[PDB]
Amino acid sequence: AKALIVYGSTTGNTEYTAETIARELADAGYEVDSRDAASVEAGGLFEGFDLVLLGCSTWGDDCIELQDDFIPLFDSLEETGAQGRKVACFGCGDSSYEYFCGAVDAIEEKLKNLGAEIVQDGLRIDGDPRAARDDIVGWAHDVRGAI
Amino acid sequence: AKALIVYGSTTGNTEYTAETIARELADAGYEVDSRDAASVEAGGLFEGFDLVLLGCSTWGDDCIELQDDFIPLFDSLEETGAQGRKVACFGCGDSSYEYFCGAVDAIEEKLKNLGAEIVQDGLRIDGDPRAARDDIVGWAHDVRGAI
Ligand SMILES: Cc1cc2nc3c(=O)[nH]c(=O)nc-3n(C[C@H](O)[C@H](O)[C@H](O)COP(=O)(O)O)c2cc1C
Ligand SMILES: Cc1cc2nc3c(=O)[nH]c(=O)nc-3n(C[C@H](O)[C@H](O)[C@H](O)COP(=O)(O)O)c2cc1C
Structure with a gap:
């Protein structure tokens, strides 16, 4: 895997x-290949992978803005090989704002229109993710569990 | 109703x-009260209504920006009386862009965290909604059907 x-x-x-x-x-x-979005090119990015998980924090004045290193990949997701791909999304955010982890829905929605198979509701973390450890661990165990 | x-x-x-x-x-x-968001104040806006449907188009340079007259209402949705409220969302958009009808997910997500009961997946229209008439009509019939 x-x-x-x-x-x-x-x-x-x-x-x-x-x-x-x-x-x-x-x-x-699992053999897990972990890459910072600032280093990838969307072209064929998911080839050869049994599971893809994408994480992205959210920002924006009003609007919902994806983390800048993630924007390029998101703009070209139709070129990543998502069609039929097992995926799930996660990201940190903060409920003080208006669009709680809005980058997560945006990626999910596009993966779905791209034919990817989302295997679990995205994980949305409020505040320091270090205090959310069992939630993250639990979310990954259930996603391995959904495959 | x-x-x-x-x-x-x-x-x-x-x-x-x-x-x-x-x-x-x-x-x-149904007795239907239809109001342009530029005219409402979120404070107690849904009081007395059996069903609330919110529509909003989407814009933004990169980011996902809600229609400006809708932003105020969205910023104060926790004051509208959404807790346990039958709701569903729709909006026009355009697939030429990157965030297809992104305002719809954003409103849905917040209504959900606010305890509203979403009664149907939001309706997202690509292009001239006039060419989407049966989809709109059909979407309203199924939402009346979900109550
Ligand atoms: C200007 C600004 C806008 C933000 N907007 C949002 C937002 O709309 N939704 C959200 O959930 N968090 C929002 N945040 C909070 C960040 O996403 C949060 O600090 C998160 O932990 C950052 O993750 P980062 O370390 O992974 O990239 C915002 C923060 C700033 C400074
Ligand atoms: C600068 C700009 C950004 C836009 N961004 C989006 C977008 O991110 N997603 C989308 O689905 N449509 C987008 N659109 C298309 C509009 O939402 C579309 O024209 C829609 O029909 C407008 O509905 P309106 O008449 O209800 O308010 C954008 C249009 C412009 C001019």
């Missing part, structure tokens, strides 16, 4: 969430 | 969608 985890993180919260998900996946036998 | 329909529309597409939904609801016996 091969997993690709791509994260867009600016203050490291979503990356720490991505490290946590990866440890639980590797702990379970 | 009393229905409130609030729409945020800039070029009139979502308002025409809102007129269509209203005709099918009134055609069915």
Whole structure:
């Protein structure tokens, strides 16, 4: 089982969430390839992967803005090979704002219109993800559980 | 049965969608109160209504921006009386862009965190809603059908 985890993180919260998900996946036998969105090119990005998990934090004045390193990948998701792909999404956010982890719905919606098979509701973390450890760990165990 | 329909529309597409939904609801016996979001104040807005339907088009450079007359209502949705409220959302958009009818997910997500009961997946219209008439009519009939 091969997993690709791509994260867009600016203050490291979503990356720490991505490290946590990866440890639980590797702990379970999965060969997990974890890449920072600022380093990938969408072209054929998911090829060869049994499971893709994408994480992205959210920002914006009013509007819902995706983490800047993630925007490029999101703009070209139709080129990543998502058609029929097992996927699920997660991301950190903050309920003080208006659009709680809005980047997650946006990615989910587009993956869905792209034929990807979303295997679990996205994980949305409020505040320090370090205080959400069992939620992350639990969310990865249930996603391995949905495949 | 009393229905409130609030729409945020800039070029009139979502308002025409809102007129269509209203005709099918009134055609069915519902007493339908249709209000342009630029005219409401969120404070107690849904009081006394058996069904609330909110429509909003989407815009934004990159980001996902809600129709400006709708932003105020969306920023104060926790004050509208959504807790346990039968609701569903619709809106026009355009697939040429990146976030297809992204305002709809955003409103749905917040209504859900606010305890509203979403009675049907939101209706998302691509292009001229006038060419989507049976989809709108059909979507309102199934939402009356979900209550
Ligand atoms: C200007 C600004 C706008 C923000 N907007 C949102 C938002 O709309 N929704 C949300 O859930 N969090 C929002 N946040 C909170 C961040 O997403 C939060 O700090 C998150 O932990 C960042 O993850 P990062 O370390 O992974 O990239 C915003 C923060 C700032 C400074
Ligand atoms: C600058 C700009 C950004 C837009 N962004 C989006 C978008 O992100 N998603 C979408 O589905 N449609 C987008 N649209 C298309 C409009 O939402 C579309 O014209 C819709 O019919 C407008 O409804 P209106 O008459 O109800 O308010 C955008 C249009 C412009 C001019």
